[PDB]
């Protein structure tokens, strides 16, 4: 319902609220299915590379999948 109502948001805050809602939906997916969570994580990272929680969660999921074989990514994020 929040995503449906996002169409009525003012354009100034529309980008920020869309990023927030997409992050929340990606969290719900990560609870349900990690693949869609990672997809939305990539979508938001392309949309806003400056955000940290998205990158943290994406790298954390990658480390879970790669058994901590992305130490370079963690160092770069640090």
């Amino acid at each position: 319902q929040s995503l449906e109502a996002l169409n009525n948001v003012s354009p100034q805050n529309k980008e920020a609220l869309s990023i927030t809602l997409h992050y929340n939906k990606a969290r719900v997916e990560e609870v349900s299915n990690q693949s869609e969570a990672e997809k939305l994580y990539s979508k938001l990272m392309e949309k806003c590379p400056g955000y940290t929680s998205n990158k943290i969660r994406y790298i954390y999921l990658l480390a879970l999948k790669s058994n901590g074989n992305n130490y370079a990514d963690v160092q770069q994020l640090l």
């Binding site: 980008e15 920020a16 806003c48 400056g50 955000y51």
Partner: peptide
């Protein structure tokens, strides 16, 4: 520096 991030 991004006003969006702020």
């Amino acid at each position: 520096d991004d006003p969006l991030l702020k």
